[model samples]
Target chain A: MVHYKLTYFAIRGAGECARQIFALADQEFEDVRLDKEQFAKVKPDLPFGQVPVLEVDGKQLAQSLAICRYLARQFGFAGKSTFDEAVVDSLADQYSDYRVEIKSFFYTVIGMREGDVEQLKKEVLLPARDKFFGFITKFLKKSPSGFLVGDSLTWVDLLVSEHNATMLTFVPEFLEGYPEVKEHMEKIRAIPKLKKWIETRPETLF
Target chain B: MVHYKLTYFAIRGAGECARQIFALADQEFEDVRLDKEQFAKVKPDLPFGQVPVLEVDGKQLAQSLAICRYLARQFGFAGKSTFDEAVVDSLADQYSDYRVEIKSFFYTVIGMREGDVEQLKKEVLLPARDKFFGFITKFLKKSPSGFLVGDSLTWVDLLVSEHNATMLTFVPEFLEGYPEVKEHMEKIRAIPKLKKWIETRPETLF
Candidate 1:
């Protein structure tokens, strides 16, 4: 009767962030995955004809970051105070922008030309990835308290950890050269609640 | 003794949203506008070497939307309910995205090229502007009596009104095609407090 449903692809792309937030919050909701046929049926009804829609109490919301922030606020992961929430949101926006660039590089350059993989790794990915790692290093240096924003865990921490894990799974030894990023990812991995969730959560192939 | 300062270009591009929020809330803060010389001197110290940094109590936060939302909450325009806040934030985000597109079209197509102006007008600006107008119409239709999200005035309403005024100034005859947008802008412009403030406020040339 809650009528809270998330409609998206089965993969952990955009919807994964919201889904993880829900899982971390221990909230129960429907995760509605659309197969090819079902997607073809539901595509027109979607706002902007996009996936990763969250329907709560019959009203739907679009945009992944909006959805994530909405859920973060709803489930109480926004932050401690108004300033704290802004910090968390700022960090999350930064992380999301970096990820979008990396994903675009992968899809447009590396995936498009298999022969250009090494070229992209050398010319494009290396510079962007190094810049991203350097950014993370500088951020942590500024904070020096483990978390991206304040003294506690925030949605950015979860997003960065998940992004790191996903990248490592795909790139295999991706963070070997980025020691700070490696350490940061390991720090998130060492969180007891997250670690426990990772160990026993339902596994699905991408 | 709070160290609250906003850093941006002298223009009202991204910082106006936060500035207006502060003004509406009757909060006093320093507005630090960086000219070319000042920007060159201070460029290296920024977190991302970007404008629109909000320094509050010695802590710096970047990202325009984040800064606006922070000011909104600080000013008590963040809505009374969680659901109301989300709706306002989501609508604000949509408006921001549309405004970005419109600005980009103006800068890139209209300002940059004389030959391609008509084509850009027909293909990009007209359609996109219509789509935006349709969205605003739909939102107004769906909202309950008072505001976009709740019964009270929000940052979104102010932002939308300012955007309408901006379009009319820049494009001259754009609003003739969108009567609803014109009417909405007029409604906000007629708000007694906002009207008085607009009359007394210094001209902000973009």
Candidate 2:
């Protein structure tokens, strides 16, 4: 069997998507969680000086999306075709872009950056949140199959679902107006294997 | 024949990577260049309200990296295997992260954002540029193949090459200290087909 070991902070921020992929596939791999001190020591030697690095057969792979994307392919949830795969990737990239909009508020909330948190929420965060929801809702409407892509669940679904939960932690009503997103989230959270993982996993505020 | 229609601004910004893939493969694609007014009308209807949307057989795909990644797969430049492909992806993503570092300075330079251009360049852009160069140079040394990933040139090379050229146009001596990157650029630019395309393509600052 190919050995898989994933190292990230002891949080679900970026690393959770890959972990959820493993959970959905019922695959076993070493999950190495680090605290701030541990991460600081390991930081300089990291491939790109960041966490969420996956070591497969002792070969290190950096970038959370890349790690999750690789796992998605290995576990057979990438997409249906080359084009579909690209579509999945496009949505994933869109999610990454959306997260950038959330960063100011997120960093402020976590005390990583100094700013008036509520002001950022009103001015920057909510507008970006709604815009992303609008875009995602449009795609969900097109799918009509209760999943983000194609007829079956894929990693992008897992990705969006994980982030949606995180978003709600910050903005309690993150899904208030997006009924389509709510319904899609409902279907995603109902997946038997994923639900088990979600329930059992250590809850993180991110 | 699978019809490939790529629409972006006339300049070679995010769209150039996909364009380079087509150029390297000697494949034909409809390159639809749009000005600001043209793009304004089309922006609302775009899947993610962004440019560099690739229409494959009339089905649109968003995100520059995703479009190039799809075309890279189609043209056989993704990687030699699944693991290698992920490595390629991780590196491509690293490039994206590095671009975020350039955005503020880039926008200021282009007058898209208000800031002191020289101050931004000195305080923000140069540090990020050096950090990115350091990261990329480390990856290049590990390969020892004169390419970014695996044993041959991949779309990452094209992507990097195009961006390197763009970077130099602004920072003239962008590769001044990075001898490895300079050499790599020399090798990539020597490809006969790509060389032809580079010479003939419409000139754009970015």
Q: On residues B1-206, what C-alpha lDDT tens digit does candidate 2 reach at each position?
A: 88899999998888988888999888899999999899999999899998999998899999999998899898899999988999999989998898887888988876678998779888898898898889889878988788989888898898787778777877887788889988888889889999999999998767
True-vs-predicted CA distance for residue A188, candidate 1, Å: 2.1
Residue A69 lDDT in model 1?
A: 82
lDDT of 2 at B123: 89
What ranges in model 2 sit over 4 Å off? none
Stretches > 4 Å off in candidate 1: A1-3, A43-49, A99-103, A109-132, A169-177, A190-193, A196-206, B1-3, B99-103, B109-115, B144-146, B200-205
Candidate topping TM-score: 2
Q: Lowest-lDDT window of 10 residues in candidate 1 chain B?
A: B108-117
Instruction: Give the lDDT of residue A135 in candidate 1.
Output: 66
- What overall lDDT, based on C-alpha atoms, would model 1 receive against the true structure? 0.73
Lowest lDDT 10-residue stretch of candidate 2 chain A? A162-171
Q: What is candidate 2's lDDT per residue for A121-157, written digit by digit as tens?
A: 8998889888898899998998879888899888999
Worst 10 residues of 1 chain A by lDDT: A108-117
Task: Give per-residue lDDT, candidate 1, residue B70.
Answer: 88
